[PDB]
Design an enzyme around this catalytic site. Structure first.
Site, PDB file in Angstrom:
ATOM      1  N   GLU A  97       4.778 -10.910  -1.739  1.00 16.60           N
ATOM      2  CA  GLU A  97       4.921  -9.628  -2.416  1.00 16.60           C
ATOM      3  C   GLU A  97       3.887  -9.428  -3.514  1.00 16.60           C
ATOM      4  OE1 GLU A  97       8.940  -9.559  -3.776  1.00 16.60           O
ATOM      5  OE2 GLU A  97       9.731  -9.141  -1.779  1.00 16.60           O
ATOM      6  N   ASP A 104       5.309   1.880  -8.084  1.00 15.88           N
ATOM      7  CA  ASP A 104       5.249   1.533  -6.668  1.00 15.88           C
ATOM      8  C   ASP A 104       4.857   2.736  -5.789  1.00 15.88           C
ATOM      9  OD1 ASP A 104       7.605   2.963  -6.812  1.00 15.88           O
ATOM     10  OD2 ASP A 104       8.870   1.440  -5.873  1.00 15.88           O
ATOM     11  N   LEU A 161      12.761  -3.334  -9.240  1.00 18.71           N
ATOM     12  CA  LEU A 161      12.838  -1.914  -9.546  1.00 18.71           C
ATOM     13  C   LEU A 161      13.690  -1.628 -10.784  1.00 18.71           C
ATOM     14  CD1 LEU A 161      12.447   1.109  -8.947  1.00 18.71           C
ATOM     15  CD2 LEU A 161      14.046   0.863  -7.044  1.00 18.71           C
ATOM     16  N   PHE A 180      13.776  -8.230   1.334  1.00 16.86           N
ATOM     17  CA  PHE A 180      13.048  -7.636   0.221  1.00 16.86           C
ATOM     18  C   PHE A 180      11.957  -6.695   0.694  1.00 16.86           C
ATOM     19  CE2 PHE A 180      14.191 -11.782  -1.791  1.00 16.86           C
ATOM     20  CZ  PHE A 180      14.898 -11.289  -2.846  1.00 16.86           C
ATOM     21  N   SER A 214      16.277 -10.024  17.828  1.00 16.12           N
ATOM     22  CA  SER A 214      15.603 -11.088  17.107  1.00 16.12           C
ATOM     23  C   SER A 214      16.620 -11.966  16.387  1.00 16.12           C
ATOM     24  CB  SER A 214      14.605 -10.484  16.123  1.00 16.12           C
ATOM     25  OG  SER A 214      13.721  -9.606  16.801  1.00 16.12           O
ATOM     26  N   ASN A 222       9.435 -12.983  19.393  1.00 13.95           N
ATOM     27  CA  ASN A 222      10.006 -11.653  19.264  1.00 13.95           C
ATOM     28  C   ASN A 222       9.554 -10.940  18.003  1.00 13.95           C
ATOM     29  OD1 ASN A 222      11.486 -10.551  21.367  1.00 13.95           O
ATOM     30  ND2 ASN A 222      13.268 -11.854  20.959  1.00 13.95           N
TER      31      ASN A 222
END
Ligand SMILES: CCC(CC)Nc1cc(C)nc(Oc2c(C)cc(C)cc2C)c1C
Ligand SMILES: CCCCCCCC/C=C\CCCCCCCC(=O)O
Ligand SMILES: CCCCCCCC/C=C\CCCCCCCC(=O)O
Length: 421
Positions: free
Chosen positions: A120, A129, A141, A213, A226, A241
């Protein structure tokens, strides 16, 4: 009179150096032989063992060409053997420094905070953002009010200290940990993810959490197929996958690291992002040489005596190479007790794959340290009583310095058991 001591010890010191070399050599063969040698862990091991082999082998050379007569003569090749012998010593520390660096980061710099710190990305100042909302730290946030002056208020309330738009790396951690629980909370409520989450383990939960996230639950709940494989422990199929996901197409690198973390259930994807072999090969073999080069010149001017193996008071040149060795040992000490602070405090509760293998590593490093460390510790101080203790001090010394090879041979072979058991 005294030569009695010396001829007896010479046998003790000679015999163990033989056991130490067979032991070291055997271990060396074992490392090269296994497919385990593609991994970074053993490259360091294999190279660590090689360094000691070369040093132990030079001990025999030093023995079978060292007399005062030779010594009195600064012969060209005589000073070379001393330079080489001392070179290998610097290596020993510097490759043990490799073992320490590797260990430390593996335990400390290898967790969920760091994983997402890479993926990230961490920003220490309040910013906006993609959605125009205020964010600080790692994708944390703050508020959806377009007013910055309110974001600081919330930032300050959560942190507890007046920020002025900035926090430390320390604080972002707390915020991050606060966000994990919230993420963990939501997953468990959800009916699409929770069964899968409950099936995984620490490293893979972190992987799922990671995906959470990036996309949120509703986004991760979507694939269905998946997560199905992840629930049924069909790892390889799950990996293939997740490749097809436009997630992967949109952000290639993060997927790889997260997906590989799913596939292997280890942090090898993330751990080996910064730690490379060539780095260690430069530290282990490439740095001891300029150190010796400087020490050679020092021996040239100040103390050019007895093939540089002679000790002349009171100008000391041995500190040119012993210095760095002592520094490197010092840094490793900081590492070792840095690890413990993380082990005893923030990982006491945890019992995982990495943890069992984490504490069993520090145990070894704590057992080995006295065995190697004593010989150097005793050097600084003498008898004293000069009694029998003098014999002991002297006779204790040979056993310890002689059997270093054996100690190191098992310690490295211990870390083959430590990896998984
Ligand atoms: C002390 C004399 C020296 C002679 C070779 N031995 C050393 C040298 C060094 C640098 N580190 C050692 O151990 C550690 C420590 C203390 C911490 C960590 C994280 C890793 C390791 C392998 C030993 C046993
Ligand atoms: C003794 C050193 C030998 C020098 C030979 C040249 C080797 C090049 C070494 C470093 C290149 C510098 C930039 C590469 C950074 C990549 C970092 C990484 O992938 O971990
Ligand atoms: C007596 C001569 C001194 C001996 C020095 C030997 C130095 C060895 C140098 C490099 C060995 C490389 C082995 C590491 C495995 C491969 C690492 C890689 O991927 O580059």
């Amino acid at each position: 009179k005294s030569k009695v001591h010396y001829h007896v010890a010479a046998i003790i010191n000679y015999l163990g150096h033989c056991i130490s070399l067979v032991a070291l050599l055997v271990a060396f063969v074992l490392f090269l032989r296994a497919r385990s040698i593609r991994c970074l862990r053993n490259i360091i091991h294999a190279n660590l063992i090689a360094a000691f082999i070369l040093r132990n082998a030079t001990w025999f050379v030093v023995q079978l060409t060292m007399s005062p007569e030779v010594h009195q003569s600064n012969v060209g090749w005589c000073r070379l053997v001393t330079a080489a012998y001392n070179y290998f010593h610097v290596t020993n520390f510097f490759w043990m420094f490799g073992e320490g660096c590797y260990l430390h980061t593996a335990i400390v710099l290898t967790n969920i905070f760091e994983m997402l710190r890479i993926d990230e990305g961490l920003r220490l100042k309040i910013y906006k953002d993609t959605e125009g909302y205020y964010t600080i730290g790692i994708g944390h946030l703050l508020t959806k009010s377009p007013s910055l002056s309110v974001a600081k208020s919330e930032l300050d309330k959560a942190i507890g200290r007046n920020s002025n738009g900035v926090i430390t790396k320390d604080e972002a951690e707390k915020l991050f940990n606060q966000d994990v629980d919230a993420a963990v909370r939501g997953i468990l409520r959800n009916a699409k993810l929770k069964p899968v989450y409950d099936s995984l383990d620490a490293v893979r939960r972190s992987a799922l959490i990671n995906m959470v996230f990036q996309m949120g639950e509703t986004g991760v709940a979507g694939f269905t197929n998946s997560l199905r494989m992840l629930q049924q422990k069909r790892w390889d199929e799950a990996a293939v996958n997740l490749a097809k996901s436009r997630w992967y197409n949109q952000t290639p690198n993060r997927a790889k690291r997260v997906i590989a973390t799913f596939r292997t259930g280890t942090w090898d994807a993330y751990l080996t992002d910064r730690l490379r072999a060539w780095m260690f090969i430069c530290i282990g073999w490439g740095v001891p040489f300029p150190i010796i080069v400087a020490w050679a010149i020092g021996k040239l001017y100040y103390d050019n005596e007895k093939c540089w193996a002679g000790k002349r008071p009171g100008v000391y040149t041995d500190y040119i190479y012993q210095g760095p060795m002592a520094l490197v040992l010092l840094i490793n000490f900081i590492f070792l007790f840095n690890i413990v602070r993380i082990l005893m405090t923030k990982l006491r509760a945890s019992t995982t794959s990495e943890t069992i293998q984490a504490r069993k590593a520090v145990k070894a490093t704590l057992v080995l340290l006295p065995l190697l460390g004593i010989t150097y510790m005793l050097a600084f101080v003498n008898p004293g009583e000069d009694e029998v203790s003098r014999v002991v001090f002297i006779y204790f010394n040979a056993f310890l310095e002689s059997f270093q090879g054996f100690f190191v041979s098992v310690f490295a072979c211990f870390l083959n058991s430590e990896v998984r058991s």
